[PDB]
C-alpha cells in the first residue's frame, strides 16, 4: 500500500512534468 | 522510517512543483 502511494506520487510528478513541458 | 523519509521527499517535490507551476 505504501508502494502504491509512491506510485501515485510517480503519476503526479509525471503529470506536473507534462504540464511544465 | 526510510519510507517516511521518501514520503517527505514526495512532499518536497510536490511543493517545488506547485512553486514552479
Amino acid at each position: 500500500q505504501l508502494d502504491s502511494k509512491l506510485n501515485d506520487l510517480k503519476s503526479l510528478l509525471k503529470e506536473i512534468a507534462n504540464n511544465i513541458k
Side-chain angles (χ1 to χ4, degrees), chain A residues 6-9 11-13 15-18:
Chain A
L6 297 175
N7 187 265
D8 303 330
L9 172 80
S11 302
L12 179 61
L13 67 82
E15 288 172 0
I16 61 174
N18 301 127

Side-chain angles (χ1 to χ4, degrees), chain A residues 2-4 6 8:
Chain A
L2 299 173
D3 278 13
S4 69
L6 297 175
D8 303 330

